[PDB]
Design an enzyme around this catalytic site. Structure first.
Site, short mmCIF file in Angstrom:
data_model
loop_
_atom_site.label_atom_id
_atom_site.label_comp_id
_atom_site.label_asym_id
_atom_site.label_seq_id
_atom_site.Cartn_x
_atom_site.Cartn_y
_atom_site.Cartn_z
N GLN E 11 31.27 47.45 -31.20
CA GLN E 11 31.30 48.38 -29.50
C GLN E 11 30.54 49.78 -29.73
O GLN E 11 30.29 50.34 -29.15
CB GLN E 11 33.16 48.43 -29.36
CG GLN E 11 33.65 49.54 -28.92
CD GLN E 11 33.14 49.31 -26.83
OE1 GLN E 11 33.19 47.78 -26.28
NE2 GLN E 11 32.58 50.51 -26.19
N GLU E 62 31.76 40.81 -27.11
CA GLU E 62 32.91 41.19 -25.41
C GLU E 62 31.61 42.02 -24.15
O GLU E 62 31.35 42.43 -25.11
CB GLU E 62 33.81 41.99 -26.01
CG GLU E 62 34.55 42.76 -24.99
CD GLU E 62 35.39 43.94 -25.23
OE1 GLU E 62 35.64 44.58 -26.39
OE2 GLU E 62 36.62 44.06 -25.07
N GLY E 135 36.45 44.20 -35.54
CA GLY E 135 35.76 42.74 -35.99
C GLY E 135 34.68 41.70 -35.72
O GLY E 135 33.88 41.18 -36.02
N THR E 136 33.93 42.32 -34.07
CA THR E 136 32.94 42.14 -34.32
C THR E 136 31.70 43.01 -34.92
O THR E 136 31.26 42.17 -35.73
CB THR E 136 32.96 42.60 -32.27
OG1 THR E 136 33.28 41.67 -31.35
CG2 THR E 136 30.79 42.10 -31.86
N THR E 170 42.17 54.76 -34.44
CA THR E 170 42.86 53.77 -33.06
C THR E 170 42.93 52.32 -33.77
O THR E 170 42.65 51.75 -32.35
CB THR E 170 41.43 54.44 -32.70
OG1 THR E 170 40.50 53.54 -32.45
CG2 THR E 170 41.01 55.86 -31.83
N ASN E 197 34.84 59.06 -37.48
CA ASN E 197 35.16 59.64 -36.08
C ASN E 197 35.47 61.07 -36.52
O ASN E 197 34.89 61.83 -35.40
CB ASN E 197 36.02 59.06 -35.36
CG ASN E 197 34.56 57.65 -34.26
OD1 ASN E 197 33.85 58.50 -33.85
ND2 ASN E 197 35.10 56.51 -34.37
N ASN E 219 28.19 60.34 -30.56
CA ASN E 219 27.14 59.51 -30.47
C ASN E 219 25.68 60.38 -30.09
O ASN E 219 25.25 59.96 -30.73
CB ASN E 219 27.37 58.13 -30.31
CG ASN E 219 28.73 57.51 -29.63
OD1 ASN E 219 29.23 57.10 -30.88
ND2 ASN E 219 29.38 56.64 -28.94
N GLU E 245 11.28 54.46 -49.88
CA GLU E 245 11.22 56.19 -50.25
C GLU E 245 12.70 56.39 -50.26
O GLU E 245 12.98 57.33 -51.08
CB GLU E 245 9.69 57.19 -50.10
CG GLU E 245 8.60 56.96 -50.44
CD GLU E 245 7.97 58.06 -49.79
OE1 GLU E 245 8.15 59.08 -49.51
OE2 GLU E 245 6.09 57.42 -49.98
N1 LIG Z 1 31.46 57.97 -33.11
C1 LIG Z 1 31.90 56.07 -32.30
N2 LIG Z 1 32.80 55.41 -32.79
C2 LIG Z 1 33.48 54.28 -32.13
C3 LIG Z 1 32.65 54.34 -31.20
N3 LIG Z 1 33.16 52.96 -29.98
C4 LIG Z 1 34.14 52.45 -31.16
N4 LIG Z 1 33.83 53.77 -32.11
C5 LIG Z 1 34.75 52.72 -33.22
O1 LIG Z 1 34.94 51.43 -33.35
C6 LIG Z 1 36.39 51.89 -33.79
C7 LIG Z 1 36.52 50.33 -32.87
O2 LIG Z 1 36.46 49.04 -33.68
P1 LIG Z 1 35.46 48.24 -32.64
O3 LIG Z 1 33.88 47.74 -34.26
O4 LIG Z 1 34.35 49.64 -31.83
O5 LIG Z 1 36.12 47.02 -32.09
P2 LIG Z 1 34.63 46.35 -31.33
O6 LIG Z 1 33.52 46.49 -31.34
O7 LIG Z 1 35.23 45.46 -29.97
O8 LIG Z 1 35.29 44.28 -32.02
P3 LIG Z 1 36.34 43.86 -31.58
O9 LIG Z 1 37.03 44.41 -30.62
O10 LIG Z 1 36.64 42.49 -32.05
O11 LIG Z 1 35.20 42.87 -29.95
C8 LIG Z 1 37.39 52.99 -33.82
O12 LIG Z 1 38.31 53.25 -34.75
C9 LIG Z 1 35.88 53.51 -33.79
O13 LIG Z 1 36.51 54.56 -34.00
C10 LIG Z 1 31.53 55.00 -30.33
O14 LIG Z 1 30.94 54.70 -29.11
N5 LIG Z 1 31.40 56.34 -31.00
N1 LIG Z 2 -1.57 70.71 -53.63
C1 LIG Z 2 -0.39 69.72 -52.76
N2 LIG Z 2 0.53 68.92 -53.79
C2 LIG Z 2 1.21 67.50 -52.95
C3 LIG Z 2 1.16 67.77 -50.82
N3 LIG Z 2 1.82 66.40 -51.05
C4 LIG Z 2 2.83 66.36 -52.24
N4 LIG Z 2 2.55 66.83 -52.47
C5 LIG Z 2 2.91 67.10 -54.32
O1 LIG Z 2 3.14 65.95 -55.12
C6 LIG Z 2 4.61 65.27 -55.55
C7 LIG Z 2 5.00 64.14 -54.90
O2 LIG Z 2 4.10 63.64 -54.86
P1 LIG Z 2 3.53 61.73 -53.67
O3 LIG Z 2 3.03 62.53 -52.96
O4 LIG Z 2 4.79 61.17 -53.15
O5 LIG Z 2 3.03 61.20 -54.56
P2 LIG Z 2 2.28 59.95 -54.20
O6 LIG Z 2 3.29 59.13 -53.91
O7 LIG Z 2 1.24 58.88 -54.69
O8 LIG Z 2 2.06 60.10 -52.31
C8 LIG Z 2 5.26 66.85 -55.30
O9 LIG Z 2 6.12 67.33 -56.62
C9 LIG Z 2 4.46 67.80 -54.80
O10 LIG Z 2 4.88 68.78 -55.24
C10 LIG Z 2 0.08 68.47 -50.94
O11 LIG Z 2 -0.32 68.37 -49.65
N5 LIG Z 2 -1.11 69.72 -51.54
MG LIG Z 3 35.30 44.57 -28.37
#
Ligand SMILES: Nc1nc2c(ncn2[C@@H]2O[C@H](COP(=O)(O)OP(=O)(O)OP(=O)(O)O)[C@@H](O)[C@H]2O)c(=O)[nH]1
Ligand SMILES: Nc1nc2c(ncn2[C@@H]2O[C@H](COP(=O)(O)OP(=O)(O)O)[C@@H](O)[C@H]2O)c(=O)[nH]1
Ligand SMILES: [Mg+2]
Ligand SMILES: Nc1nc2c(ncn2[C@@H]2O[C@H](COP(=O)(O)OP(=O)(O)OP(=O)(O)O)[C@@H](O)[C@H]2O)c(=O)[nH]1
Ligand SMILES: Nc1nc2c(ncn2[C@@H]2O[C@H](COP(=O)(O)OP(=O)(O)O)[C@@H](O)[C@H]2O)c(=O)[nH]1
Ligand SMILES: [Mg+2]
Ligand SMILES: [Mg+2]
Lengths: 78, 430, 427, 427, 430
Positions: E11, E62, E135-136, E170, E197, E219, E245
């Site tokens: 859900q 559901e 449980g879903t 809840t 939450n 959400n 990465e």
């Molecule tokens: N942040 C957020 N949490 C949600 C939302 N809806 C449900 N929850 C969370 O989900 C919990 C309830 O369990 P769920 O996994 O949603 O239950 P379900 O998905 O319907 O599983 P079944 O009842 O078996 O179908 C609650 O404690 C909420 O915290 C939502 O829209 N936003």
């Molecule tokens: N001078 C310069 N250094 C850079 C730039 N982008 C990343 N770096 C350096 O590259 C390092 C990270 O390495 P990374 O970019 O992940 O290497 P890669 O995995 O081979 O692409 C960091 O310490 C940065 O300071 C750039 O545009 N100019």
């Molecule tokens: Mg449900």
């Protein structure tokens, strides 16, 4: 006299590719979007590059007053 | 000039053929009266000016189903005397359809075939649509299969038979008629393409999303396969695969010649807007066991030789990329002595959609028609029904009266027993 | 003044030659109407190599089209550059071989072999002096494979003093296109090794990987493949059609490429292949065409040339180039990697220079190489046949049409001899 | 007519070369479309050190951009001066090394090494005289360090007589960017000693500091930091591209700056770093370029050069300058502070003058310093590596791709060995 | 092309997923019907012309939580076979979601994950959304995660699960249902991000000045954390952080893989004007326990590995100075053997604001996902809640009668008891 059926109509034309008559662009679509205005042009004069420092260009008269008033690139502290 | 004639015997045969020429007349743009406003040459006879007649025969011992063809929407398209009727049905008896009452009507069917073949320039193959579970389809179908084998010898014949399912079946003497038919198919029919009703019911339930499927819905998409397996003759593509290619590439042994079926893109109107239908995706759906037209597990058996025909805009390379991804999967298996196992066929014309049909316009389609050793299981279950039932000599008085003999069930039993011996032996490694 | 007789067989070679006569006609400058409109007088000097004169300025190519189904003849006729073909050379059947080697060779091929040998001899007699016999077909099918190897067996009996290039596409190991390919492959090469003087073997997987990795082409068709084989096939006879600083004909190819009569198997390639957007970054010079010439990816065969030593080599350079510069990578590729060449043959590489490049390109080259890597190409076919004939499968389509299983054993007799001799000289 | 081949890896390597080839391009006067529109004849004299001439005046670099993700090249696809590169030289991966040194080196590394070395080998044979190979990568990362350091070891095997410039950035001591930062650094320096011939040490924290106190910038992006690194890389090969009164190529610095083969970790510096506020007031003469050369604030490494002695130093001056003022200023820094220089080597300073300055600057100079103070950087990374390895934390990843702890103990052994000989020479 | 598959179970999964994919369609400009008027390949699957399909499935037994998606404003978005319903719910029972009704639907769950994985070109990881209370989300998530490690080995699996709060819960069998879930999410899920939450109730109370938060409001910023987690794939920035990465930087040991979550800027529409949002302010805001999204106090435990993913106008220098100011504080204490605890990622896309939402448009935002030894307070408290209720066999006959035995309570308790021993042993200073 078999019925004509449409081709897959690819843009390939490997004869044209191997003759190089039409250039086109072999590259695919660019990924990861294209963010506008990042990194931002700095306040206290618009600096998007280090070309001024690395080319030693003379300061313009309309921008000299900013560095006359301030030391760093943070703007107008006093 | 490519040309294939099709025969339609049994209540399954005509009602499948009603949807077959419904799609056939739509691909070539001809109106149902018989006027087009030369791919039509392989299915229609150009008669004079603006008139066309299909090159097929309808025949049934029961006079019922012919009349609704004669008084239906295709009264003008079909030839009035190509429609073959009978005094009465064979009534679920192989004895009546083959000996007593089919004999007076098989010879009127034989001459009209000769009228059709003499009209065409070069014939390619034979298509038979029937059901071995009933009397008319199994009886006169086998009776015609004797006559066309001796008259038009060595010609390629491809058969579409609606076999009984292990679960859903509509006759009590149905296992009797299937066993007696198989003694005629093995020595005479070249390649028998299997069919089963409830597998097509299942492919309408989960794919087309209809919870009330009928015989009209099943036969409508059977015709999609039949047009797909004869799509090479009509329209041009990359690799043309005609009926002569199909037999010589796919049957390894004289007594091992049975065949599965698949048709992967089967998508309703609402489902089509969300599916990304590429060559790689439609290839994977065809080889899955849920999409075949007989309920047998290909995991239980092993594939022997496979053939694929692609319709629509398919580039000739991702078909070869899909084949490489197919052969590298462990869940699909092949017999060890057949390393080259796929035949590729590409056609460029996409499948048409009938008005009012539940099938949506799809730009790519694949039909997987493959031999397998899993067809032993659908023959083991049907033989298991016969052996438990013949032990009490049940329902035999209907059979021995109309020209059959009591012992004839025994040779038909060991012929199927020999077939089961063939299927188990050739699937064994060495 | 020497001319080539072209044979096209099956649904492959008809579509191969449809794109092959597209290039040769455009290289010689004739329109789809048939009249000449090229701007080069040298372009019209050697036309009898590939075309014949006709009244009214029409040019009709000297080639035949041969199959057993009229559907593929409708493809070559209705396609581009299809109206130039001789209607009398459209010899075809009605049954269709149906991927069987027996049908095109013995049973239903016999009523068309006698028809085409009357056709083939007509341009053989009309032309002034025969130079060779080019064929283009397959080995996996039955329309051009089983029927083609009978025609090449029949045409050598009448004309036993001519060379013959063959361009036969062999079944690929990675991808299966026909179940009975190892039957028709083994039986066709059984006829060729006794008969075919030289052979250009190709495959479909190499042309795929060429058009993916090098051409960088997303979704290509067979028309893209049939152009690249046409680029090779036109490059084989570039010295006959055009003058040059060093000309090499079909027999010049033969004399420098088959050390032994039974080792006649080659591999082909087209050198200046560039991508759709990479042609402005390349430098069209003779160092880098040779770089693309000897690469394993660039070859049009399933064989990897690094696995087997090259017994010999060929080069068909076209364009304006320094013959000293031509000779110096060809000497360099002998010396930089001499471990991948044979030792008892000095000057392993033959070279030629043609003074006219192909259309739209400044320079081009074509490599022909007899190697013991075609050993690997036959081992897969030999493994396929031996591991399958033990259970005598699929023989009822074959043994029921005229030949016995003893012919299949004889196909094992010589194909196992081909694989023995190629590995012997590798040591 | 000596050449340098440029190869780059990872996020850090590709972004530097996006700016490095940008800085080289407008020094030579060639547009991002590749055509040359420079106003000086001296630019076109030595272009071949960094560019291939192409048809129509296009110039394409010896740039081979290596990565395991398409993200880096996507920036190169769309960034300024990113269209000058060869599309064929963009070798790419799909999986990504995932900031893991084991994935880029051993398991997933092998699938791309045979492809990236093919691109290197094509460019190596095209140019005649190879001065060496120049790589720019990271060390704390996994994509450019794991795959890069194997690539350096392979290319020393194929070309053992050619030098190796590596511009590898270093884990910062004050701040950190990744979590496996000391793991990927110690495994790379363990390999960088054996294969590479000379190393320039960079780190972002010194590039960040040099943008603050010397440039007066409180918002430095990476593109601001890459520019100062790119000025150093142009200063090393300014002698190759341009004439000079005294010439010092890449191999002349190698015999100067490297007393023993394992002491090849240097620290860099760029002289005319002026803020825009104080730009007018400073003068440009050799004594005030030298006074910013030897400042510890101007060094782009973590190590304070006041802690350790200068074993050997080099200076790459650019501009119309007096040879005395080059000589006397570098002689005064040997007498004013001789405790910061090594007694048992006379005249620790290498000097060279090129008469062509960069664009706009009247004078410029680049500093390369083989200091023994670099051991402070290597001690801290070895300090972090022993702290995390003794708990075996973050080790179940590296052992997942096929590593055992034998080379991890070997990496700390060679790290402790190379820092031991620095402090032995400091006494 | 990079791609990540999100499975929504229970859900909580769909109601997060409605908020998750609402945030996703506003970033790419895709309207709710699925039409955009090059970076959607991470989450959306392009089909046909101008149609984008979410690469996700809604799996819940559901049907009354899935049918509101099927009739809401997102009818044309989802593929109807992705929305998987069931006859009846698991009714917060681990045994029903794992043994009785779980196995009847998980076969259809893999049938579409394979369809989603086959359409994917380059796969980097999985997202799973579930709640261990019901449980879903608990049982069927355990069944699907166990099957996926067998089916798709060595691939990343991001665990976005919700745990019972200390003072707030809840359901009654939540101590029972959470402990049995920890046997599966230990050894199968590679990265698990705890959510709670009541901590988000407190976050919405003071930062967003909402006196009466609801499940929609919680959400919505759940969607902000996950979108910030994977914004590195969709958009370009200074320092990208990929899924693998993300997994090797924060998981020092294969069992010590539970991580916290903190999104720093939660500002109202009226407090946004008065706050000076800089990278120094938000980075100090993230490490505050008020911004912590799980009801645990990080001052008791030790931070062990942290990643800071920045969105918007974050320049690379002061963020490197912001990390230094965090390290100097004695309150934020790191473990002794890790002198390099920080991972940094900067993306250039400012976070989108939903119209009618509660969050304000900010130009800078950071999401911290941190591994700490203070998460042992979450497990040990749920261990005490289970041990008190199990001691008199409460609510066991519901669990045992639906296929289970008493022996699975001892194994799950012993497995969770090892985690509390492991957290204390790893975080101990040597
Ligand atoms: N942040 C957020 N949490 C949600 C939302 N809806 C449900 N929850 C969370 O989900 C919990 C309830 O369990 P769920 O996994 O949603 O239950 P379900 O998905 O319907 O599983 P079944 O009842 O078996 O179908 C609650 O404690 C909420 O915290 C939502 O829209 N936003
Ligand atoms: N001078 C310069 N250094 C850079 C730039 N982008 C990343 N770096 C350096 O590259 C390092 C990270 O390495 P990374 O970019 O992940 O290497 P890669 O995995 O081979 O692409 C960091 O310490 C940065 O300071 C750039 O545009 N100019
Ligand atoms: Mg449900
Ligand atoms: N798929 C499909 N199967 C059909 C159709 N019509 C009949 N059948 C099958 O045919 C079986 C009965 O055998 P038939 O030979 O057709 O019956 P019949 O032709 O009337 O022969 P008699 O009963 O002897 O008169 C049934 O079990 C059905 O499965 C149809 O329209 N579509
Ligand atoms: N390159 C290429 N190969 C083809 C073409 N047409 C058919 N083939 C190949 O030919 C094989 C099938 O054999 P086939 O051509 O039917 O032989 P046939 O029966 O004698 O005509 C397949 O493996 C195809 O790859 C074509 O136009 N180009
Ligand atoms: Mg009937
Ligand atoms: Mg000198």
């Amino acid at each position: 006299h078999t019925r004509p059926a449409p081709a897959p109509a690819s843009d390939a034309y490997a004869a044209e590719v191997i003759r190089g008559e039409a250039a086109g662009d072999d590259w695919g679509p660019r990924t990861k979007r294209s963010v506008p205005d990042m990194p931002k042009p700095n306040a206290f004069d618009g600096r998007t590059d280090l070309y001024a420092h690395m080319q030693y260009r003379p300061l313009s008269n309309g921008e000299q007053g900013k560095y006359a008033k301030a030391f760093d690139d943070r703007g107008t502290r006093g | 000039m490519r040309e294939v004639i099709s025969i339609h015997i049994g209540q399954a045969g005509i009602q499948v053929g009603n949807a077959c020429w419904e799609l056939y007349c739509l691909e070539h743009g001809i109106q149902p009266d018989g006027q087009m406003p030369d791919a039509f040459n392989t299915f229609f006879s150009e008669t004079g000016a603006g008139k066309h007649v299909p090159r097929c025969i309808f025949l049934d011992l029961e006079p019922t189903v012919v009349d609704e063809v004669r008084t239906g929407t295709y009264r003008q398209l079909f030839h009035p005397e190509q429609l073959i009727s009978g005094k009465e049905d064979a009534a679920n008896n192989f004895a009546r359809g083959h000996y007593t009452i089919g004999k007076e009507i098989v010879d009127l069917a034989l001459d009209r075939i000769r009228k059709l073949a003499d009209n065409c320039t070069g014939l390619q193959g034979f298509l038979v649509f029937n059901a071995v579970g009933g009397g008319t389809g199994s009886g006169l179908g086998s009776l015609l299969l004797e006559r066309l084998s001796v008259d038009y010898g060595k010609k390629s014949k491809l058969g579409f038979t609606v076999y009984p399912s292990p679960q859903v079946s509509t006759a009590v003497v149905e296992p009797y008629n299937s066993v007696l038919s198989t003694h005629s198919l093995l020595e005479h029919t070249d390649v028998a393409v299997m069919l089963d009703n409830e597998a097509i019911y299942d492919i309408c339930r989960r794919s087309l999303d209809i919870e009330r499927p009928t015989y009209t819905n099943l036969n409508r998409l059977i015709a999609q396969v039949i047009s797909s397996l004869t799509a090479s003759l009509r329209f041009d593509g990359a690799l043309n695969v005609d009926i002569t290619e199909f037999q010589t590439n796919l049957v390894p042994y004289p007594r091992i010649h049975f065949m599965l079926s698949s048709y992967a893109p089967i998508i309703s109107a609402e489902k089509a807007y969300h599916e990304q239908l590429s060559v790689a995706e439609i290839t994977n759906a065809a080889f899955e066991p849920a999409s075949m037209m007989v309920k047998c597990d290909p995991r239980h058996g092993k594939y022997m030789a496979c053939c694929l025909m692609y319709r629509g805009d398919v580039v000739p390379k991702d078909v070869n990329a899909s084949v490489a991804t197919i052969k590298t999967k462990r869940t699909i298996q092949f017999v060890d002595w057949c390393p080259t196992g796929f035949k590729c066929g590409i056609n460029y014309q996409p499948p048409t959609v009938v008005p009012g049909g539940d099938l949506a316009k799809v730009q790519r389609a694949v039909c997987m028609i493959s031999n397998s050793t899993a067809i032993g299981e659908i023959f083991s279950r049907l033989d298991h029904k016969f052996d438990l039932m013949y032990a009490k000599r049940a329902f035999v008085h209907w059979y021995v009266g109309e020209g059959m003999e009591e012992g004839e069930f025994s040779e038909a039993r060991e012929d199927l027993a020999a077939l089961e011996k063939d299927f188990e032996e050739v699937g064994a490694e060495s | 003044m020497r001319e080539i007789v072209h044979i096209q067989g099956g649904q492959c070679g008809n579509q191969i030659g449809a794109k092959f006569w597209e290039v040769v006609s455009d290289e010689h400058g004739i329109d789809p109407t048939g009249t000449y409109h090229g701007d080069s007088d040298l372009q019209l000097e050697r036309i009898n190599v590939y075309f014949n004169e006709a009244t009214g300025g029409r040019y009709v190519p000297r080639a035949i089209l041969m199959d057993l189904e009229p559907g593929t003849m409708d493809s070559v006729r209705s396609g581009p550059y299809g109206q130039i073909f001789r209607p009398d050379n459209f010899v075809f059947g009605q049954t269709g071989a149906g991927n069987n080697w027996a049908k095109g060779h013995y049973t239903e091929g016999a009523e068309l072999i006698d028809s085409v040998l009357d056709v083939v001899r007509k341009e053989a007699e009309s032309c002034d002096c025969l130079q060779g016999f080019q064929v283009c077909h397959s080995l996996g099918g039955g329309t051009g494979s089983g029927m083609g190897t009978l025609l090449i067996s029949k045409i050598r009996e009448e004309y036993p003093d001519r060379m013959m290039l063959t361009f036969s596409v062999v079944p690929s190991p990675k991808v299966s296109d026909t179940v009975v390919e190892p039957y028709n492959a083994t039986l066709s090469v059984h006829q060729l090794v006794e008969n075919a003087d030289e052979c250009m073997v190709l495959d479909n997987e190499a042309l795929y990987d060429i058009c993916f990795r090098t051409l960088k082409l997303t979704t290509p068709t067979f028309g893209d493949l049939n152009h690249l084989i046409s680029a090779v096939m036109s490059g084989i006879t570039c010295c006959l059609r055009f003058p040059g600083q060093l000309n090499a004909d079909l027999r010049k190819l033969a004399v420098n490429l088959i050390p032994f009569p039974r080792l006649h198997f080659f591999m082909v390639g087209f050198t200046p292949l560039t991508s759709r957007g990479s042609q402005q970054y390349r430098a069209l010079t003779v160092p880098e065409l040779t770089q693309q010439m000897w690469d394993a990816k660039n070859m049009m065969c399933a064989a990897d040339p690094r696995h087997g030593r090259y017994l010999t080599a060929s080069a068909l350079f076209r364009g304006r180039m320094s013959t000293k510069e031509v000779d110096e990578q060809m000497l360099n590729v002998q010396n930089k990697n001499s471990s991948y060449f044979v030792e008892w043959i000095p000057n392993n590489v033959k070279s030629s220079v043609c003074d006219i490049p192909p259309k739209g390109l400044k320079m081009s080259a074509t490599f022909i190489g007899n190697s013991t890597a075609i050993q690997e190409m036959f081992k897969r076919v030999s493994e396929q046949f031996t591991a399958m004939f033990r259970r005598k499968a699929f023989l009822h389509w074959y043994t029921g049409e005229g030949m016995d299983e003893m012919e299949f054993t004889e196909a094992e007799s010589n194909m196992n001899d081909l694989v023995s001799e190629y590995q012997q000289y590798q040591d």
